[PDB]
Design a binder for this molecule. Structure first.
Ligand code: ZN
Ligand code: ZN
Ligand code: ZN
Ligand code: ZN
Lengths: 345, 341
């Protein structure tokens, strides 16, 4: 009988569900396994009001397959013109679980993002006061800064000053990719946490570029050198409660990935939990998987831990090469590869 | 408009491919360049005099009427290559140089480089230049560090043992390489592509991933780009024009695993002119394009002239290739310089 592992039902603290037909297609891969997910607000029209958040939440709930138990945790897209009252009442009414900071032009659907971050300090002050967490895509966008350096520059230039001025603001440093970030979070306090994706644990920039260029490994923040990958792996393997599961599943149609200018984002929802299990196994750290997947996140946000359990079984499972999307398709993470772990039905 | 008359240039590093691709891409080179160093990495690599002669003939047959062009052939070095094949090829005028590709068996590429030291000794003796793709392949080495490791681990020992061997450090991409060449002597030269002068890795990756800027060796950080620019702008005679034009069909570039190589032949000379202009170094363009290479190899300089004219020049979006196409360097963009023949 193959090795099994019982853990509390996990949550995904960072995901893109998109909208319309894409939403219908991709959500089931998440709702099958995860009880809750932090749903990012970067649609074509960003989610900046309570009304638009309620409407999007309804569309997500309508896409949940029968027999799945799933609750989306909505987020507000911060902007330079955002009204603080909208953020405050959204949080107190339970519409917004958190607010998300995109530096302007840092990534997908970020043209309406925040251009001069210190200008919205009055929003952070209000968030600190009410206990609303701030989620951050932590990259500078200055053209003179090399893409591989943008996360590290963010830490010193933007994040540290925020933490000095608002010491009791809950901040999630989303999808960390560097030793710089890992060390900074490890040296922080209970008000600073971080999510880590499976791709930044499993791969480094050599996988994207050696022997050919692989746009399905292209995501933001970009894959870093092996040194940084190893630091992330050691961070989560340490069992520190500052790190938790956030996939940053970010699906795009195949033709938008395999083009002259490929979109950033990996569609990793289909194999997400098994992928993480494989990593924790390689790190001799399966004892810390549960905390990372199911405990650390809820404890950071101040939300309850799930009552359910899931069973991971160490039996092979082949990822499909493509996932249909109308007359187009989406290429999943680890397409055509065999994972060592499966989830028991 | 401003004009610049220079000696007819040569391209000291090019891939012409073969068959229909060869027919399509060669004219872009033969229109402007009198000679080109033709790399030997075909599907069946060029490792014998016979195969080199045959490939040369196919190239010459593809030269359009009214173009004056001569391909300078190269031998693909392998672990099992016979030294006599190299020697007679050089003396018969078939091989102009030999090319070292680090592997990634002995038929197909050099795996243990010190094992072919006896070939280098023979090349040194006869005056045959060694062209090097200078990257290690060790899996522990990050892709952006591979050029720098090559310098210390492979190139320096070769230069210590064979101090009078002519070596071209092909398509340099790093400050490490630039500084090493600048600190060398007349037996060490280097080619520089337009893409490594014009761009850095941010251009390939910021705001989207751009496989038409993906080439080997990979684009480096801006620091290295600036060092290359300063190297050629200094007017050092150790650097010369080598495009490393490396065309692939569009569908092979824009795929789940894109091929390395930029097709820069169509706008090659105008692109370089733009760079030298930005660097306030147009006085050094002629040497880089037409003098430094021939003088390094010990070959004659071209008698012809070409005129560069500062009038706009729109690059096409696509170049036909049978039922397929090839995306050129700077597709859809406007260069400030054009060539009058
Ligand atoms: Zn992000
Ligand atoms: Zn995201
Ligand atoms: Zn090469
Ligand atoms: Zn080449």
């Amino acid at each position: 009988q193959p090795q099994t592992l019982k853990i509390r039902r996990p949550d995904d603290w960072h995901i893109h569900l998109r909208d319309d037909e894409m939403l219908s297609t991709v959500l089931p891969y998440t709702s099958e396994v995860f009880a809750r997910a932090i749903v990012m607000p970067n649609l074509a029209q960003p989610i900046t009001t309570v009304a638009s958040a309620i409407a999007y939440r309804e569309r997500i709930l309508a896409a949940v397959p029968a027999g799945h138990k799933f609750t989306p945790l909505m987020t507000c897209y911060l902007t330079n013109s955002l009204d603080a009252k909208e953020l405050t009442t959204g949080f107190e009414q339970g519409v917004f679980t958190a607010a998300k900071l995109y530096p302007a032009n840092a990534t997908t659907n970020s043209t309406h993002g925040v251009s001069d971050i210190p200008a919205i300090y009055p929003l952070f002050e209000q968030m600190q006061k009410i206990g609303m967490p701030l989620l951050i895509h932590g990259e500078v966008t200055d053209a003179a800064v090399d893409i591989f350096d943008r996360e590290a520059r963010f830490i010193d230039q933007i994040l540290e000053p925020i933490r000095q001025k608002f010491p009791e603001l809950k901040i999630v440093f989303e999808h960390i990719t560097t030793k710089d970030a890992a060390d900074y979070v490890l040296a922080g306090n209970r008000f600073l946490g971080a999510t880590v994706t499976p791709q930044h644990l499993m791969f480094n920039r050599n996988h994207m570029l050696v022997g050919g260029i692989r746009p399905h490994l292209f995501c933001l923040p970009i894959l870093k050198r092996s040194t940084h990958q190893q630091a992330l792996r050691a961070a989560v393997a340490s069992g520190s409660d500052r790190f938790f599961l956030g996939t940053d599943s970010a699906p795009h149609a195949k033709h938008r990935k395999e083009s002259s200018c490929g979109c950033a984002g990996v569609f990793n929802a289909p194999a997400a939990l098994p992928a993480y299990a494989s990593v924790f196994e390689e790190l001799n750290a399966l004892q810390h998987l549960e905390a990372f997947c199911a405990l650390n996140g809820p404890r950071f946000y101040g939300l309850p831990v799930n009552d359910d359990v899931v069973e991971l079984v160490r039996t092979p499972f082949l990822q499909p090469e493509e996932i249909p999307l109308g007359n187009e398709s989406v290429i999943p993470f680890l397409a055509g590869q065999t994972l060592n772990w499966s989830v028991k039905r």
